[PDB]
Amino acid sequence: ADAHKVGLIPVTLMVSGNIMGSGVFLLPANLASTGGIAIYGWLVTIIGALGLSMVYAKMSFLDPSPGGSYAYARRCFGPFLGYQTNVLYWLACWIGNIAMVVIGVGYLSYFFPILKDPLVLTITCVVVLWIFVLLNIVGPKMITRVQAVATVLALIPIVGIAVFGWFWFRGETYMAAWNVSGLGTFGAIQSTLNVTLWSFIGVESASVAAGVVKNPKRNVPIATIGGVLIAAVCYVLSTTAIMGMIPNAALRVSASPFGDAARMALGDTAGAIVSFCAAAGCLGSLGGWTLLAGQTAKAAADDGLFPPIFARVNKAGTPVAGLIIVGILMTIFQLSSISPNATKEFGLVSSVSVIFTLVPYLYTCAALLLLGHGHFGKARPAYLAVTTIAFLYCIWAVVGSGAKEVMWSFVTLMVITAMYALNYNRLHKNPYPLDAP
Amino acid sequence: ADAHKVGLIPVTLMVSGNIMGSGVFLLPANLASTGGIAIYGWLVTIIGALGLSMVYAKMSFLDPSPGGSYAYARRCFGPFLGYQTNVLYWLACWIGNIAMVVIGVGYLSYFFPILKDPLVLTITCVVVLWIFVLLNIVGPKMITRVQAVATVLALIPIVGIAVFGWFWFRGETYMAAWNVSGLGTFGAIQSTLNVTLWSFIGVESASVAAGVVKNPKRNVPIATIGGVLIAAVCYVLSTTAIMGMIPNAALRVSASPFGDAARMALGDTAGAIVSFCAAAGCLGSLGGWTLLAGQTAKAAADDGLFPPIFARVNKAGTPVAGLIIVGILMTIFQLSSISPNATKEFGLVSSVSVIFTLVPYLYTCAALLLLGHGHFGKARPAYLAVTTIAFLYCIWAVVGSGAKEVMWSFVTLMVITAMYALNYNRLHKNPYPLDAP
Numbered sequence: 100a101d102a103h104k105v106g107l108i109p110v111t112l113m114v115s116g117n118i119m120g121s122g123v124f125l126l127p128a129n130l131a132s133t134g135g136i137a138i139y140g141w142l143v144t145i146i147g148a149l150g151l152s153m154v155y156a157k158m159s160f161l162d163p164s165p166g167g168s169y170a171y172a173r174r175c176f177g178p179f180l181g182y183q184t185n186v187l188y189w190l191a192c193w194i195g196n197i198a199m200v201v202i203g204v205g206y207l208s209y210f211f212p213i214l215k216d217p218l219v220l221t222i223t224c225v226v227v228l229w230i231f232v233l234l235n236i237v238g239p240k241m242i243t244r245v246q247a248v249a250t251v252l253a254l255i256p257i258v259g260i261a262v263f264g265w266f267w268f269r270g271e272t273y274m275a276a277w278n279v280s281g282l283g284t285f286g287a288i289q290s291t292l293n294v295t296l297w298s299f300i301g302v303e304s305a306s307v308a309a310g311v312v313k314n315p316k317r318n319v320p321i322a323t324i325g326g327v328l329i330a331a332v333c334y335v336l337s338t339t340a341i342m343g344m345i346p347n348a349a350l351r352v353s354a355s356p357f358g359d360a361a362r363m364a365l366g367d368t369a370g371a372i373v374s375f376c377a378a379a380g381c382l383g384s385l386g387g388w389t390l391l392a393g394q395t396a397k398a399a400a401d402d403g404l405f406p407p408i409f410a411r412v413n414k415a416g417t418p419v420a421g422l423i424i425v426g427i428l429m430t431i432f433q434l435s436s437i438s439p440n441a442t443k444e445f446g447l448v449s450s451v452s453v454i455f456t457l458v459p460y461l462y463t464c465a466a467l468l469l470l471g472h473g474h475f476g477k478a479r480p481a482y483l484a485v486t487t488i489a490f491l492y493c494i495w496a497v498v499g500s501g502a503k504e505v506m507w508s509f510v511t512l513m514v515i516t517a518m519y520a521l522n523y524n525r526l527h528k529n530p531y532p533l534d535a536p
Numbered sequence: 537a538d539a540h541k542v543g544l545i546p547v548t549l550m551v552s553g554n555i556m557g558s559g560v561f562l563l564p565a566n567l568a569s570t571g572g573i574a575i576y577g578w579l580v581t582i583i584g585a586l587g588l589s590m591v592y593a594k595m596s597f598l599d600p601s602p603g604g605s606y607a608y609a610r611r612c613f614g615p616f617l618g619y620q621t622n623v624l625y626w627l628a629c630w631i632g633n634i635a636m637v638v639i640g641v642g643y644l645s646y647f648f649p650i651l652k653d654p655l656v657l658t659i660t661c662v663v664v665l666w667i668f669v670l671l672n673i674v675g676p677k678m679i680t681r682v683q684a685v686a687t688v689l690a691l692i693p694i695v696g697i698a699v700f701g702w703f704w705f706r707g708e709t710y711m712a713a714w715n716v717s718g719l720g721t722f723g724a725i726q727s728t729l730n731v732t733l734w735s736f737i738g739v740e741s742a743s744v745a746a747g748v749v750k751n752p753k754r755n756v757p758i759a760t761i762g763g764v765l766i767a768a769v770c771y772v773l774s775t776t777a778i779m780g781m782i783p784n785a786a787l788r789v790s791a792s793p794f795g796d797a798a799r800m801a802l803g804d805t806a807g808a809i810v811s812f813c814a815a816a817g818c819l820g821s822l823g824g825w826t827l828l829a830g831q832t833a834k835a836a837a838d839d840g841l842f843p844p845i846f847a848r849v850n851k852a853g854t855p856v857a858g859l860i861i862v863g864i865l866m867t868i869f870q871l872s873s874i875s876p877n878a879t880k881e882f883g884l885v886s887s888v889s890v891i892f893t894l895v896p897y898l899y900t901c902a903a904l905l906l907l908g909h910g911h912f913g914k915a916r917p918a919y920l921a922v923t924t925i926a927f928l929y930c931i932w933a934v935v936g937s938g939a940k941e942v943m944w945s946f947v948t949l950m951v952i953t954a955m956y957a958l959n960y961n962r963l964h965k966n967p968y969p970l971d972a973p
Contacts, residue, residue, distance in 0.1 A: 161970055176616050177967040461950055465957035472961045473973045483958065490954040497947055502939035509946045510934055513898055517927040520902035521920065524909045530967075531611040533598055536910050 104313035109243035114326025116250035117301030131350035140291025147492030156320035165310025166398025168459035171466035185399035192392035203381025209374035249383025261336035268343035276347030546680035551763025553687030554738030577728025584929030593757035602747030603835025605896035608903035622836035629829035640818030646811035669863035686820025698773030705780035713784030
C-alpha cells in the first residue's frame with residue numbers, strides 16, 4: 100500500500116466516473132419520453148443501487164481480493180462459476196468501450212465536425228482506445244489520475260445545473276409533463292426503470308480493482324458507497340432540474356440536452372464547455388473500464404481459470420500483454436463505426452454484453468450471504484434485507500430488458516459451460532469425484 | 537430392495553414413450569409447412585440426439601446415481617448447481633404434464649365429444665392426473681408396466697405406417713412439396729430443427745430413474761440408447777411415409793394427420809384405433825414424467841438440497857408425499873384449460889419450462905468430461921467429439937427458440953440463485969471460505 104497503489108480519491112472518482120460515463124448527459128432525453136414521474140423510478144433505482152453498493156462494500160471489506168466479483172464467486176461456488184464470472188465481466192468491460200468512445204468522440208464533433216464522417220470517426224476512435232490502453236500500460240496511478248481529472252471535468256456541468264439551474268427551474272414546466280408516456284402509473288415507473296436501473300453499472304469498480312488500491316479493506320468500501328452516492332445525487336438533481344428548465348417536447352427531440360440547452364442559454368461557449376466536459380467523462384471512463392478488464396483477466400489467470408498470458412506482468416505488476424490483447428479486440432470491434440449499418444449490426448452485441456454484468460452482481464450478493472454469515476452477528480436481519488433488495492435490483496433489470504438480448508445472454512452462458520468443460524477436464528477438481536478407474 | 541426395481545424392457549419403453557409422447561402424432565403436420573427437405577433436419581437432429589444419448593449412457597454407466605443429471609451436476613460442480621439442476625428439471629417434469637393430459641384427453645374426444653367442452657375437459661384432466669399420481673404411489677413397477685403397454689399401443693399406428701404405408705407412398709407426392717417454406721436450404725433446415733430438436737426431450741429418463749432400475753450400470757445405458765433409436769427410427773419412417781401418401785396442402789391443415797389419413801383410408805374404425813392409441817401414448821407418458829418428478833426431488837432432498845418431505849418414503853422407497861405434492865401442483869395449473877384465454881396465458885409457462893430441461897443436458901455433458909476423463913483411455917478423442925456434438929444439440933435448440941421464452945428461463949436462473957443463497961447460507965460449504973470471524 101505504498102508505491103504503485105491508488106489512493107482513496109482517485110478510486111472514488113473512478114467508481115463515480117465509470118458509473119456516470121456517457122449516460123449522465125443523455126438521461127434527461129431518455130426519461131423525457133416518460134416525464135417527471137420518472138422521479139419515482141429514481142427513488143426505486145437508488146434504493147436498489149445503494150443496496151447493491153452496500154453489498155459490495157461489505158464483501159470487499161471481508162475479502163479485498165483482486166478481481167472482486169470473480170474472486171467472490173470463486174470462493175462460494177468454485178472454479179466453474181469463477182471462470183464464468185470472469186468471462187462475462189471481462190467481455191462486458193472491453194465490449195462496452197466501443198459505444199463509449201463513439202459517444203465521447205461524438206461530443207468532440209462539436210469542435211471538429213469531420214468526426215461525424217464515419218471513417219474519420221473510426222480512425223479517431225481506434226487511436227483514442229490505444230491512447231487509454233497505453234495510459235493503462237504506464238500504470239494504474241497514471242490511469243486513475245487521468246480519470247480523476249476527467250471525472251471532475253465531467254462533473255462541472257452536471258453539478259453546475261444540479262445547483263444553479265434551480266433559479267431557472269419552474270414547477271409548472273416539470274408538472275406540465277408529469278406523465279407523457281400514455282401509460283398508467285406502474286407502466287410509467289417501469290418505463291423509467293428500463294432506463295435508470297442500468298445507470299449504476301460500475302458500482303463494482305473499486306471491488307474489481309482492489310489489487311491496485313491502497314489499504315483496500317478500508318478504501319474499497321468507502322470508494323464504492325461514495326461513488327454510488329455521488330452518481331445518485333448527480334442523476335436526480337440534474338435530470339429533475341433540466342426537466343424543470345426545458346419544455347418536454349424540446350427535451351424529447353434533443354440528442355444532447357445539456358449541450359443544446361446550454362448553447363442556447365448562455366451562448367456557444369456554454370455549448371463548447373458542456374461538450375468538452377462530456378467528452379472528458381466518456382474518455383476517462385474508457386481508461387477505467389480498460390483497467391477493470393485487465394484486472395479481472397489477471398486474477399482469473401492467476402488462478403488458472405483464464406489463459407496464462409493474461410497474468411503475465413511487468414516489474415510493476417501491470418498486465419501489459421492482457422491490456423494489449425484487449426486493445427486488439429476493441430480495435431477489431433471498433434470497425435463497426437465505419438457505417439450506419441455496420442454500427443447497428445454491432446448494437447445487439449453491445450446490448451447483450453451490458454446484461455453480462457448482472458451475473459457478477461448476483462454472485463456477489465450470494466457470496467456475501469454464503470461466505471459472510473458468521474460476520475453478521477445480530478444484524479443478520481438487516482443484511483438479509485439489504486442483499487434481498489440487491490437481488491431484486493438485478494432481477495428487475497433483466498425483467499425489463501429486451502427479450503432477444505437476454506436470449507443471447509442465456510446462449511452465452513451455455514457456450515461458456517461447454518468451453519469450461521472442453522478446456523478444463525483433467526485439470527478441474529470435482530467436489531464428489533468418481534472412484535479410481 | 538431388488539424387489540421394487542424395474543427391468544430392461546419397461547425402462548426402455550419408458551424412455552421411448554417419454555420421448556414420443558404427444559409429439560409423434562403431430563410431427564408430420566408441423567413439418568409440412570417446411571416440406572420433404574425436413575429429412576435433412578432429421579439427419580442433423582438424430583446425430584445430435586444420438587450423441588446426447590451416448591453421453592447419458594456413458595455417464596450413467598460410470599455413475600448410476602438416482603436423479604440422473606441432478607447427481608452428475610452436484611458431483612462436478614457442487615451443491616449449488618445440483619440444487620439448480622433439480623429445481624429446473626422437477627419443474628419441467630410436472631409442468632409439462634399439463635399440456636400432455638390435455639392432448640391425451642383431447643384424443644379421447646374422438647369417442648366422447650363432451651370432452652371438448654373446456655369445463656368437462658378440465659375436470660377429466662384433473663381426474664386423469666390423479667389416476668397416474670396414484671399409480672405412481674402403487675410403485676414404479678406398476679407405473680412402468682402401465683406405460684409399457686400404453687407405449688406399445690401408441691406404436692401401433694406409428695409402426696404400421698412406417699412399415700406398411702410404403703405400399704401407398706409416392707415420390708412425386710413427397711417431392712412436389714420438397715421445400716414449401718419459401719426459404720433457402722439452410723433456412724428450411726433451420727425451420728425443421730425448430731421442431732425436431734425438441735422431439736427428443738426424455739432422453740434422460742432412464743438416467744434420472746436409475747434408483748428404481750434393475751442393474752442400472754447395465755440397463756440404463758441400454759435403455760437410454762435403445763429408447764432414442766426407437767424414437768429416431770419411428771420419427772423418420774413415419775413422417776417420411778405420410779409426406780408421400782398425403783398431399784402437402786391437406787397435411788399442413790390437419791390437426792390429427794395419422795387420424796385424418798387413417799379415418800379416410802381404412803374407414804371410421806381406423807380413425808378410432810389411431811385416436812385411442814395416441815391417447816394411450818400421451819397418458820402413459822403422464823405416468824413416466826410424474827415418476828421422474830418424484831425421483832429427481834427425492835434424490836435432491838436425500839442430499840439436503842430440496843425440502844425433506846420430498847425424501848419421505850413408504851416401506852417400498854416410493855416418495856409418496858412427493859408424488860402427492862406434484863399431484864396438487866399439477867391440479868392447480870390444470871385449471872388453465874377451463875378457457876381458451878386461460879390456456880393461452882398458461883402457454884408461455886409451458887414454453888418456458890420446456891427450455892429448463894436443456895440445462896440438465898448441458899451439465900450432464902460437462903460432467904462426463906469433468907468426472908470421467910480418466911475412464912476414456914486413448915479413446916479420449918471420440919468422447920470429446922461425441923460430447924461436443926451433444927453440446928451443440930443443446931445450444932442449437934436454444935438458439936432457435938422464441939426469445940421471450942429464453943428470457944424468462946434466464947430470469948428463472950436468477951431467482952434460483954437468489955433462493956439458494958437465502959435458503960442455504962450457514963448450511964452451504966464454501967470451496968474457499970473466509971477465515972474464522
